[PDB]
Design a protein around this ligand. Structure first.
Ligand code: HEM
Ligand SMILES: [C-]#N
Length: 137
């Protein structure tokens, strides 16, 4: 289930973080424009770029912490608040996060590894609701 999925992702955080983030950028090319230093780079080029590894690591570690602190895939309002108030997220709208979770769920469904993809979709929906409540446009 969802709790096991957090363990699966955490166990190989670098591979899952990089692969899911790449799936997101590749499914929604306009999203890459927010990450000025990943423009014009292939998947394999990014996988040897230290900054890319560090960024994806930190993003997915935080995502997993928010997921772990959720109850029944409902994230804490305080965690949603953290995400809205980060200066790095100042220009974002809920649609950016929607796209990330659509890509994440698609990745999980396509994977040979078992995932509770339905629950990640629900988690993403609940997170979008919480981001909106916390002031994201
Ligand atoms: C639950 C989902 C998300 C989480 C947990 C998250 C988390 C983070 C974290 C921890 C950082 C700073 C890490 C570092 O030092 O590199 C960061 C930076 C950033 N985030 Fe997110 N993020 C999420 C979604 C998004 C989305 C959907 C976008 C845009 C489509 C976005 C855009 C950015 C940008 C442009 C930065 C600065 C780039 C950089 O760190 O060099 N984030 N995010
Ligand atoms: C940040 N993604």
């Amino acid at each position: 289930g969802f709790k096991q999925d957090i363990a699966t992702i955490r166990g190989d955080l670098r591979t899952y973080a990089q692969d899911i983030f790449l799936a997101f950028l590749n499914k929604y090319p306009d999203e890459r424009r927010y990450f000025k230093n990943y423009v014009g780079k292939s998947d394999q080029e990014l996988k040897s770029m230290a900054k890319f590894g560090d960024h994806t690591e930190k993003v997915f570690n935080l995502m997993m912490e928010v997921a772990d602190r959720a109850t029944d895939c409902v994230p804490l309002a305080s965690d949603a608040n953290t995400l809205v108030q980060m200066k790095q997220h100042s220009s974002l709208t809920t649609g950016n996060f929607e796209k990330l979770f659509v890509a994440l769920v698609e990745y999980m469904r396509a994977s040979g590894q078992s995932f509770d993809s339905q629950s990640w979709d629900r988690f993403g929906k609940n997170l979008v609701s919480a981001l909106s409540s916390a002031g994201m446009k």
